[PDB]
Structures are given as structure tokens and as C-alpha cells.
Design a protein around this ligand. Structure first.
Ligand SMILES: Nc1ncnc2c1ncn2[C@@H]1O[C@H](COP(=O)(O)OP(=O)(O)O)[C@@H](O)[C@H]1O
Ligand SMILES: N[C@H](CCC(=O)OP(=O)(O)O)C(=O)O
Lengths: 15, 267, 15, 17
């Protein structure tokens, strides 16, 4: 979750 | 009164900011497509078309903002977000708009070329002739130029905005008409919001000039550019940019828009 | 608002 | 393309799950 909150939408696109 | 249509060959048309961008800053697809189609059919007929477009800044905001949101931490997407630099926007929006124009005109069998001139380089002497030579050659080649003020690199008391660019350009090119395509359907005796005004067919000084309300631009600059463009040749016409057929009926001799003619005292 | 943030979609963050 | 569209239209929490 911390990852999901300090990450950039683009990052979500990359595994 | 509008009788020059039997002579007009070289035409300069300007599309403002509220004619190219609709909702959200994206392109107004139908409006731009219709205007491009009419310009293409005008070019095919034999007229020489000069285009001075605008609206790159909005496209700018759009794509740049998107990129912002794309590369921004989810939580960080709530904290204050910087405002996109005006110059930075221009550098993206001009490219986007020029590419869209190129694709439409390649679909419409017309070839266009990019021509960016900064307004502070117009005091030079060699440019005064080089611009006239290059535009003459490209018009003889049946190629529609798309002039625009270069905002990516540049440097108020004086407003030398897009209207001034179009006016002084048509002063240089020795054109015939400088059509000002805008959201409104012409001049008005005050704001168009209320119902105590009237559409003005012809612009005579000592009947409407210092008797009407004039308000990065606005009609307080539109009128000041149009008067200077008018005196020195080149009658100008202001017409609504929404209507797709407006150019045709303007050039067919019909009575559409407002005239700023140097010999308007006769009419 | 963070609660709302979590609910919204990147699409919505825009507009 | 479809994955991009799915990610563009999803809830943060959904992105988590
Ligand atoms: N007679 C008038 N007096 C004052 N304001 C006017 C008058 N007629 C129109 N306006 C307003 O001024 C604005 C001028 O827009 P315009 O300068 O043509 O395009 P842009 O500002 O988007 O480049 C219009 O949106 C219109 O609402
Ligand atoms: N590049 C844009 C062109 C748009 C524009 O100039 O319209 P105007 O300020 O004359 O109403 C700008 O300089 O603001």
C-alpha cells in the first residue's frame, strides 16, 4: 500500500 | 456595398482561440474540419489563401497537464500542482496544432508549410523583403502557409498580439481581405449578453467608434488592429467562426459581418 | 480528502 | 491498448487489488 501511494500512475502500468 | 468580391484574390484568414478549442482545451474537431475544408475548396477555386492560426497555448495546457498527471504519485496528485509554464505550453501546442493541420490538409489534397515569425524581428530591413519573397513563391506554388507568433522563444504598455501580426502581415503581403473569424458574429453596440444591442453591418467612425463598449486579447485590441489594417488598403471583415459556410457567403458578395473600409464614407 | 482520492480514478483526478 | 484503458479507468484501491 505504501508502494501504491508513493508510486506514479505510469509505474502502475509497468509490472 | 460589399462589391470587392469580384476582384479578391489574396485572402488572409485568422482563427482565434475560441474557434480552435472547445471543451477541456482539446481541438474543436467539427469546427476545425469545416474551416479546413472550406479553405481547401477556396484554394482549389484559384484564390491565394493565407492562414494565421492561434490556439496552440490551450492545446499546450492540455497535453502538458496530462503528462503531469501521468507521471505523478497517486497521493501526490492531491497536493498543490505547479502551473504549466506558458512558454512550455506553446512549444507543445504549436507542434500538436501544426501536425493536426498537416494531417487534415493532406487528407484534403492541399499542402501546407510551417512559418513561425517572432514579432520583435519585424523591425529588420532584410526580413521586410524576404517575407514578401518567400510568401510570393509559396503562394505561386499553390501552398497555404500557416503563420503564427513564435511563443516558445521570445522576450503591457503595447499589445503586439496575433491581431497585430495578421494586420501587419496583410499590410506586407498586399492582400485583399483580412477575415477575422471569431466567436461573435461581428461587432456589437455593447456586450452581446443583453438584448440592447444590434449587429453592425459597416464601421463608420462618427457613428459607432466612440459610442460603443470595447470590452490575451479582446475587442479592445480587435478594433485597434482592424482600423490600422483597413487604412492602407485591405478591407477587413469580422464574422462568426462557428458557421461552416461563413467564408463562402462572405466571398460570394453577400452581406455578412462588419466592414472596416477606408472608403466607407461613400457607403 | 485522501479517502476520496483513494476512490477516484486517474481519469477522474483529471477534471 | 486495452490494458492502458483499464488502468485509466480504475480505482486506486482497485489498482491495489
Ligand atoms: N461589442 C462588444 N463589446 C464588448 N465585448 C464584446 C463585444 N462583442 C463581443 N464581445 C466579447 O469579446 C470577446 C472577444 O473574443 P475574441 O477577441 O473575438 O476572441 P479571443 O479573445 O478568444 O481571441 C467575445 O467572447 C465576446 O463575448
Ligand atoms: N499564441 C496566442 C494566440 C492567441 C491570441 O493572441 O488571441 P488574442 O490575444 O489576440 O485575443 C497568444 O499569444 O495569446
Amino acid at each position: 500500500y505504501r508502494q501504491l501511494v508513493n508510486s506514479s500512475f505510469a509505474d502502475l502500468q509497468k509490472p
